[PDB]
Design a protein around this ligand. Structure first.
Ligand code: AZM
Ligand code: AZM
Ligand code: AZM
Ligand code: AZM
Ligand code: ZN
Ligand code: ZN
Ligand code: ZN
Ligand code: ZN
Lengths: 209, 211, 211, 209
């Protein structure tokens, strides 16, 4: 069965249902978006943000990439963060990793993957830093642990951006780390504690005028 | 409201997980064994274009990349890595590039306001604006936004087919590529005609196919 | 030891520092006060194209960026940051893009061997190969390398003039841009004619100059 | 006109070079075999071939603002891959310099447009070493951050499989230098890392055969 032609038919059925059951929603969204959440998650087909959050179109500004990696100088994630934080003024930035992330699993192996190798470098940087801890775990346990370390490192890379530090001080922007369990459907919050003195050093080092 | 949208979203997630356990208890545990999506979706980050919702599909159906204005920069590692993985490893049957009506990324490229880090990101849209300037200036402002959104999807399909991994999959298994526009006002997807002369793809094969 | 090129280079550095102190004792201390180069050079990393040597110039004269095959990716931060700094802050009067004969980067783009991380880097040369394929196929292999090297310089000058900082400097203070080919066999630089129809530069100004 | 003057000086240099090293340019035309890859600053005061007292063909060169190695940068990535795997250079040199205004800009808090994402790695080092940098004078902090940047660059360089392979297979060496723009001297940084550091890097980054 052609999944593309099947998807177009299901789109038309969904759009007609939306007109019947929430007739104001799509026309009000056409006037302009006002999402309160920026979601940075994995491209993994099992992590569709709006479905797993039980939300609607217009609720979640979304960036998805392999293993939800934030490269500090990546223009793709950089442009979405600039737009979502400065222009849409989202109240929340969520970084969501997930269980059974094959990107994280690839980083724990040493098989050459072409253009994927430079993309996964930040996961291999965390692997080197945390090697003794990761080697003490089973492969399945290491995949969860490195997925968590990657979310926490992402929150650090996110808060190293002046536009985020500005929004946190000016209008109480909040940032959050999650792990999605692909087997249960539950989001879990990471404790993601950093000393107060961590954000002070970051403000000094990264906030610009 | 007075409601924290983050804590409200976690509560709704638990309600959705409860519904999955009650109505389709096999689905999430079978997906945890491994994904097998047949579709790679490259679309806009715009909150109004959630691919799995608007396609009426489930988790596991759509491998997804979303960025500002669904732009494919040829040497971007972010889109590059997702295309390599989806095409070579997951062996998707379809790559969809979906633009949308009222794309403010496309609209920003038709303006000349300095937007900081967004300026280098939108360069491919300004390249299309320069190439098609006479055509775009002959339209109304709102028609030029729709037209540039279409040209951007078509240019994205060209950038996509400049990748050896995609040309190989098109030859080896008839991987298909599709250009769509999402109408944020109606919820309908429409297909772009997106024909290219045969001699276009032959020159591309010669110029970009790699061992 | 005596065959180590690195320890030999450090010894030659100390000999060069001694020569500077003996022959031009004011030069290095006056440069330490601040640089004022009038030229930004964008050239190939090729060991045969050291800009300051081949121009017969001194330290402080040439602000320099060198990469594989002197390629300007429009959204590359590495070349982007050097252009912003050289044009807006140092206020260079000249931006030079220098290609060269026997550029193996240009030759690699005319081949179809997979080269790992070099593949995405060379995409702009394969874009030119696809656009100019009939012309390149009508030439010998060696002539196609020279022609693609020239097209690459000219395309770089286009990418350079798509940047508002360059367009601003050209309009406000007569910044000039130049395309060169370095002949690695003779040591001579030759200028490329690099003329563009008037309507080309007007569309670029409209599409890329910031308000 | 500095540009037309430079083209005239080029022609004079090429004619002189045919007299003084009559066969050098012709040997160069048949191919290049440099033994050194130089990664340095774009600063007009740091021309590698001049300050090393070397000739064309001796130094494969990459220069960027503040000699920064972004791990997933294709520009520096492509030159390292080509120089190490194809030319088989014996030495990779990362050269920082005194009075580097790129390093100085990272110690400031002015917004600089497209320069901001480029300088993030220097601001990462500033945050990590902030107590040490704040304890120094302005001019001493610039020298210190320039040194930390070279050392961090050598770490990013050795996180690349192509470099780790060459070090193991053929004793490729990597070196950190600071160029003094006022004296003309290169000095070597001690750049010591525990043995356990390079073992974790090999485990985390070297691609399987
Ligand atoms: C090599 C590689 O990237 N493998 C992946 N496996 N799953 C991935 S996911 N969770 O990003 O879809 S990526
Ligand atoms: C400056 C800029 O990028 N503006 C945008 N407006 N909407 C965008 S969208 N459709 O990508 O959400 S981007
Ligand atoms: C594979 C590849 O890139 N080959 C090269 N040959 N010479 C180059 S040069 N002129 O940039 O040094 S690049
Ligand atoms: C803001 C900025 O980049 N300023 C610079 N000053 N000197 C530089 S150098 N040493 O790279 O030429 S960069
Ligand atoms: Zn994943
Ligand atoms: Zn959009
Ligand atoms: Zn070259
Ligand atoms: Zn410098």
């Amino acid at each position: 069965s052609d999944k593309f032609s099947a998807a177009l038919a299901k789109n038309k059925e969904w759009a007609a249902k939306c007109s019947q059951e929430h007739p104001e929603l799509l026309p009000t969204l056409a006037v302009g978006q006002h999402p309160e959440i920026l979601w940075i998650g994995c491209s993994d087909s099992r992590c569709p943000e709006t479905t797993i959050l039980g939300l609607l179109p217009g609720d979640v500004f979304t960036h998805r990439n392999i293993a939800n990696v934030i490269h500090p100088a990546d223009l793709s994630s950089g442009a979405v963060i600039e737009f979502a934080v400065r222009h849409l003024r989202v109240k929340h930035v969520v970084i969501c990793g997930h269980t059974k992330c094959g990107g994280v699993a690839a980083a724990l192996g040493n098989k050459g993957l072409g253009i994927l190798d430079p993309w996964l470098i930040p996961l291999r940087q965390l692997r080197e830093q945390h090697l003794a801890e990761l080697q003490s775990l089973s492969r399945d346990e290491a995949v969860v642990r490195l997925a968590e370390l990657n979310v926490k490192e992402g929150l650090k890379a996110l808060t190293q951006k002046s536009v985020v530090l500005e929004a946190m001080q000016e209008r109480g922007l909040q940032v959050h780390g999650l792990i999605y369990d692909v087997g249960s459907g539950f989001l879990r919050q990471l404790d993601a504690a950093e000393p107060e003195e961590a954000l002070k050093a970051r403000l000094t080092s990264f906030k610009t005028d």
